[PDB]
């Protein structure tokens, strides 16, 4: 919601009372990538005239946004670490500072794995930040979590992608969403009539 609302008010920022414009763009760029998909960025924050001009005064944030699009993943993490430490200190973001770093990492992994089919994690260990065991350790946790569609073969050190149809997730959540509502309706029934 924030990305959609903020991006609409990027060109109209009369509320200088909180979060002066220089910080408003950073917030709009910090939440824009975690919110929208790649085709949306092309005409919302990259080609956007208002936002590109402000970044000229900010060297750190500008390299963070364009790193993801330019596929310079090595500089992405170094930029994602500084945003990591800055978000903790910054108010209104510390509560979900851990969520942002973890979610951005998944968004980066899926971006790289989408193109290829059988890339080797030895190749990921260099083009996505140093470490072969880190990518192995980091990837394993995310696959078990249910995101980052890919499946790892250790002996040959190769990760093969898969293409789960957009129904298993859709069905898996329509039951999980239904359960939450269903529990709520059950609790209402017991509230009435003792």
């Amino acid at each position: 919601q924030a990305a959609e609302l903020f991006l609409d008010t990027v060109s109209t920022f009369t509320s200088y009372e909180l979060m002066d414009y220089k910080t408003f763009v950073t917030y709009t760029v910090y939440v824009s990538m975690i919110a929208l998909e790649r085709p949306d960025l092309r005409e919302k924050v990259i080609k956007g005239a208002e936002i590109l001009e402000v970044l000229h005064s900010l060297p750190a944030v500008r390299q963070y946004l364009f790193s993801l699009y330019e596929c310079r993943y090595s500089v992405f993490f170094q930029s994602l670490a500084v945003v990591e430490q800055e978000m903790k200190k910054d108010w209104l973001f510390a509560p979900h500072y851990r969520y942002y770093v973890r979610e951005m990492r998944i968004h980066a992994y899926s971006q790289l794995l989408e193109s290829y089919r059988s890339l080797t994690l030895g190749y990921m260990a260099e083009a996505f930040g140093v470490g072969v065991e880190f990518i192995d350790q980091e990837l394993s946790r995310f696959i078990a979590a249910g995101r980052l569609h890919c499946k790892i073969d250790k002996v040959n050190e190769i990760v093969e992608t898969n293409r789960p149809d957009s129904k298993n997730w859709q069905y898996q959540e329509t039951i999980k969403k239904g359960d939450l509502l269903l529990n709520r309706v059950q609790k209402l029934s017991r509230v009435i009539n003792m």
Partner: protein, 286 residues
């Protein structure tokens, strides 16, 4: 020819009245008359019928009488009362399509060049519709006989006019599939359809009794259709068809799920709406 023939309730009733009016003999005899009606966009409608005298001895079924003058004289009467209705065919109880009713059609072919005969039982105790409508179709072949001329069936259903429906439903006041929803469908098409399928299948089995005791020396054509029937049986449910079924049977369950959940919520709110009502009434009272 004609895709379908719709039979109004009045004509259906005027045939039952005809049989009882003359059926004092009791044992058995057909009753034959002349049908009236009109058609549009190649779909016939039959509304009125009058009784034409007709007798025929049982033995040597090549003798029978139908009063042409009575047909012509009376039609002058019916034409005056209603000009729209014109002769369209003939009807006869004739539960078994007696043989001689292929030269009779030639007698009535004069008044209606393309006439249809509708067999409507007067004593029905069964499950199927009591109105079979046949039309005459010609083709000569070297198998059956040198003179070949046979009837071809046209689907028939019981129609309803605005005026007739008022009386028909008033006359019944006996049983109606009230609350026409999942209850009537599970009984008006599912169970009844299975009953009909079994009877038609049983009819095929009865004819196939000729395998042992020959009645007719293998009709040939009947076998041809039966072979095509078997090939058309749905392919065994073991291949990708099974996945397709589940991906669609379950897809229909989601909508049922959503509908039920919405039903519960509305039901729960309804109870709350009512329950707060009497609590408020009771609290003020005492």
């Amino acid at each position: 020819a004609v895709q379908k023939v719709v039979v109004h309730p009045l004509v259906l009733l005027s045939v039952v009245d005809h049989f009882n009016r003359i059926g004092k003999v009791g044992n058995q005899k057909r009753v034959v008359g002349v049908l009236l009606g009109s058609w549009q966009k190649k779909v016939l409608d039959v509304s009125n019928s009058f009784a034409v005298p007709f007798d025929e001895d049982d033995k040597d079924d090549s003798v029978w009488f139908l009063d042409h003058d009575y047909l012509e004289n009376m039609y002058g009467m019916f034409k005056k009362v209603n000009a729209r209705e014109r002769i369209v065919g003939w009807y006869h109880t004739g539960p078994k399509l007696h043989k001689n009713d292929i030269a009779i059609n030639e007698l009535m072919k004069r008044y209606c060049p393309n006439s249809v005969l509708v067999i409507i039982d007067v004593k029905p105790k069964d499950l199927g519709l009591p109105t079979e409508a046949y039309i005459s179709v010609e083709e000569v072949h070297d198998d059956g006989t040198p003179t070949s001329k046979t009837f071809e069936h046209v689907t028939s259903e019981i129609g309803a006019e605005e005026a007739e429906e008022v009386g028909v439903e008033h006359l019944l006041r006996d049983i109606k599939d009230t609350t026409v929803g999942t209850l009537s469908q599970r009984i008006t098409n599912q169970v009844h359809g299975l009953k009909g399928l079994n009877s038609k299948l049983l009819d095929i089995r009865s004819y196939l009794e000729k395998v042992a005791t020959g009645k007719l020396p293998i009709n040939h054509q009947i076998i041809y259709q039966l072979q095509d029937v078997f090939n058309l049986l749905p392919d065994v449910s073991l291949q990708e068809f099974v996945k397709a079924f589940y991906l669609k049977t379950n897809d229909q369950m989601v909508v049922v799920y959503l509908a039920s959940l919405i039903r519960s919520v509305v039901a729960l709110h309804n109870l709350i709406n009512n329950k707060i009502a009497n609590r408020d009434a009771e609290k003020k009272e005492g």
